[PDB]
């Protein structure tokens, strides 16, 4: 649906968090729980060149 409004896949220095965010992802993405979310599969998973 309303895929991504403010999603930005620029390369950032990402903070590593031990909390497990990977427990409600394809279930929330499927029906819909986030206003703006983007799914990057395969080669697109890489960091984008600046």
């Amino acid at each position: 649906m309303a895929s991504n409004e403010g999603v930005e896949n620029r390369p950032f220095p990402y903070l590593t968090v031990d909390a497990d965010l990977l427990s409600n992802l394809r279930q929330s993405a499927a029906e819909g729980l986030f206003h703006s979310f983007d799914l990057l599969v395969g080669k697109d998973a890489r960091e984008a060149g600046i």
Partner: protein, 49 residues
């Protein structure tokens, strides 16, 4: 009709349609809710008891 989680969010965080008045002789519909601290679980199911 929209998503399930969208409905779950809108349940609490948005007032339902034209709820009844409280502490009045008869029940009118309330446009401005100051005291209003209500919640209505039948609007979800569309079922009456």
């Amino acid at each position: 009709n929209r998503g399930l989680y969208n409905m779950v969010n809108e349940y609490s965080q948005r007032l339902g349609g034209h709820p009844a008045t409280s502490n009045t002789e008869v029940q009118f519909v309330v446009i401005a809710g100051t005291d209003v601290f209500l919640e209505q679980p039948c609007s979800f199911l569309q079922e009456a008891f």
